[PDB]
């Protein structure tokens, strides 16, 4: 299509345009946080290792569902579980127009025989041209003229995965803009709104066991599943449609003999796949050109 979702700014709030961090690695839960090197792919043939939650690419625990109507029948891209934008981890890249790149997530080196991972990613355009420092947002109201080091904001705390992901209502913006070479017919620079365009997205679709299931939606993401045979891996060609600044995120899908919610909403589960010592698995991020 593909789908536009359209959030409406508040903070606080889930859609407050939180700031992102490229180098925290470690998993979700107590404890020393661990920071590596920015996760900057520019010039590509680089890999980076990090953990990703459990259910952090799509779980009903986010207590937000979206829709995507660009989906024949209808009532199959209805009801979309979001991820989690914080579980999952964020890097970047600088590229040209017409890239032709492979990126592949895979378990890390260390969690090789552990089985759990089922990395998914989303790719989104930025044509700003770089880190987005919008003031007012939910990190950046307390008088910052910056963002902080190797950070960067994206629109809420749980995310949208095959979409066009736009926020209006933000704190007016007389310095909104893009390098010259972006057509802003096509991609406009509202003062009060910013959209991170949907470039392509996929997940490790090949479970550890075939009579289970994966934590993941019927039908709405018939075309993202990946299958290569291998469980906790995925790889994937991408061309790069613009010239410009690039935002990764990587997550994971969990796998269960079934799933569903409790009372509050919350997920619950019965015969997970989760052989790993953390709340998050640890995977290597590569992109390779070609
Ligand atoms: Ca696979």
């Known amino acids: ?67 995507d109507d660009t989906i024949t029948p209808v009532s199959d891209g209805q009801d979309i579980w979001r991820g989690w934008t ?43 041209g770089g880190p987005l420092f919008w003031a007012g947002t939910q990190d950046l109201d307390e008088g910052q003229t910056a963002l902080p080091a190797d950070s960067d904001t994206v629109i809420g705390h749980v995310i949208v995965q095959h979409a066009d992901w736009t926020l209006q209502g933000l704190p007016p913006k007389a310095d909104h803009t893009a390098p010259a070479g972006v057509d802003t017919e096509l991609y406009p620079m509202k003062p009060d709104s910013y959209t991170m365009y949907y470039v392509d997205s996929g997940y490790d679709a090949d479970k550890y066991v075939a009579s289970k299931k994966l934590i993941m939606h019927p039908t709405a993401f018939k075309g993202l599943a990946l299958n290569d045979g291998t469980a906790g891996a995925f790889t994937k060609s991408i061309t790069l449609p613009k010239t410009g600044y690039y935002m ?28 790993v010592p953390a709340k998050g698995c640890w995977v290597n991020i590569t992109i390779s050109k070609p």
């Open 248 to 275: 990764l995120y990587v997550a994971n899908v969990l796998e269960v003999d079934d799933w569903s919610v409790d009372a509050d909403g919350k997920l619950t589960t019965t015969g997970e796949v989760w052989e």
């Open 1 to 67: 299509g593909v789908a536009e979702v359209v959030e409406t700014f508040k903070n606080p709030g889930t859609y407050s345009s939180p700031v992102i961090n490229f180098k925290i690695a470690s998993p979700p839960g107590p404890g020393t946080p661990i920071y590596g090197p920015p996760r900057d792919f520019s010039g590509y043939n680089k890999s980076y290792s990090l953990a990703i939650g459990k259910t952090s690419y799509y779980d009903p625990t986010t207590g937000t569902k979206w829709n």
């Open 86 to 128: 914080h579980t999952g981890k964020w890097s970047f890249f600088n590229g040209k127009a017409g890239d032709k790149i492979t990126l592949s997530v895979q378990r890390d080196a260390q969690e090789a025989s552990l089985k759990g991972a089922h990395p998914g990613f989303i790719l989104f355009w930025r044509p700003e």
